[PDB]
């Protein structure tokens, strides 16, 4: 609606120029203004093109967030192309350049996600999207146990509890969460208590001005704020179908192919960041700088639509009409480097590949070694923490600047 109005006001500016005219100075303003009124055609089109797109998407990540939380990296990319290729049979528009992982999530909620000690990765990132959003409450498959971490983190603002179903004061605790709607993590949910049926279906009781929801026999005030976490550190634990169907699931087992992208992003980050900070930026080339893009393109409507007859300032439209063109030009060649990003940063990714695929073969050796003994229990904290004092604190890495030396170093070390 906000371009709508923008292209009333620039036709009001037209009508303006013709009546100047009614002369090479009104003339030369009024070609310069149908320059940038073909920028706004051009801008509408795109928009356009847009609806096909939302429309398609909000389906693709729809059916991607209710269903395929339960799956591995491997069949959650199986069953979206198989959905994108059916969509494409059926004519229905939908934009493939975006990804799943970006459309659904915000860059600040990101970057908290980030400082949450969120592990970085395609699998954990979706994850923390149907965490984000839901219609039922989640079962967070953690056999690492960093989702634990990362919902401790995440929701320590609102003081988030720990509690377990063993937990005898489980039903108090419980009960303090619905009174004042502070969220609750359960780390074990292999042994159900069936008390939670009422409140996962949301069997609520809209009577006068409180919400109730009877737990035994008992009536308790529901709050919106209360949000409930159930986790269960087994991978090949089994539940009910009411469960299954009652809940959402949303795993966090490490795969070898979710460990090998994670191990290579925390290379990447480590060593050369600045390809680390590109990539991050690849979307901050269409993020950070097309912010201020349109934080330009604001400012420009804002100027255009509060003319009030400025007379006396007229170098601001066209100083605004130059800035903008810069930004979308400066785009244009961020576009370009993710192009050389698919030459280079793409091949910066392929050359530190070797190192996380042995990484990855590294931690199911030692999952493996965990048979040959009943002693031989490792964990990922104990493989990341290796990584991490082979990547950091490595004496072997001092007067060491090569990066394919630094390569060799790491991995050998």
């Known amino acids: 609606m906000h371009l709508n109005v923008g292209l009333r006001k620039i036709k009001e500016t037209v009508d303006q120029v013709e ?7 009104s003339t030369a303003l009024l070609k310069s203004l149908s320059a940038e009124r073909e920028r706004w055609e051009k801008t509408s089109e795109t928009f356009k093109n847009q609806m096909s797109t939302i429309a398609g998407d909000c389906l693709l990540s729809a059916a991607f967030i209710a269903y395929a939380g339960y799956f591995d990296q491997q069949m959650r990319q199986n069953l979206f192309t198989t959905w994108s290729h059916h969509l494409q049979q059926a004519n229905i528009q939908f934009r493939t350049d975006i990804a799943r992982t970006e459309y659904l999530s915000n860059a600040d909620e990101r970057l ?29 498959i953690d056999p690492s146990g960093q989702a634990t971490e990362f919902i401790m983190n995440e929701y320590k603002d609102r003081k988030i509890t720990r509690t377990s179903f063993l937990d005898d004061a489980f039903r108090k605790n419980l009960e303090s969460a619905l009174r004042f709607g502070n969220p609750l993590l359960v780390q074990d949910v292999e042994s159900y208590d069936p008390v939670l049926n009422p409140v996962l279906n949301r069997e609520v009781r809209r009577t006068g001005g409180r919400v109730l929801i009877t737990l035994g026999d008992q009536d308790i005030d529901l709050s919106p704020s209360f949000v409930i976490f159930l986790s269960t550190r087994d991978p090949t634990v089994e539940f009910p179908p009411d469960l299954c169907s009652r809940v959402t699931f949303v795993n966090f087992t490490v795969t070898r192919s979710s460990l090998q992208s994670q191990c290579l992003n925390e290379v990447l980050k480590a060593e050369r960041p600045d390809v680390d900070e590109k990539r991050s930026d690849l979307l901050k080339l269409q993020g950070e700088f097309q912010l201020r893009l349109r934080q330009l393109e604001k400012s420009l409507l804002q100027a255009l639509n509060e003319v009030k007859g400025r007379i006396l300032d007229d170098d601001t439209i066209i100083t605004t009409l130059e800035n903008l063109k810069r930004e979308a030009a400066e785009v244009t060649r961020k576009v370009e480097e993710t192009d050389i990003v698919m030459q280079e940063v793409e091949t910066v990714s392929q050359q530190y590949l070797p190192l996380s695929t042995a990484c990855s073969s590294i931690y199911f050796t030692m999952e493996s070694l965990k048979q040959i003994h009943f002693l031989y229990q490792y964990s990922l904290q104990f493989f990341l923490d290796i990584y991490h004092n082979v990547l950091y604190e490595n004496p072997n890495l001092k007067g060491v600047t090569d990066h394919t030396q630094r390569l060799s170093i790491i991995t050998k070390d």
């Open 19 to 25: 009546e100047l005219r009614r002369v090479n100075r």
């Open 112 to 140: 908290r996600w980030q400082a949450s000690s969120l592990p970085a990765d395609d699998l954990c990132t979706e994850n923390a999207i149907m965490l984000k959003r839901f219609n039922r409450y989640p079962l967070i």
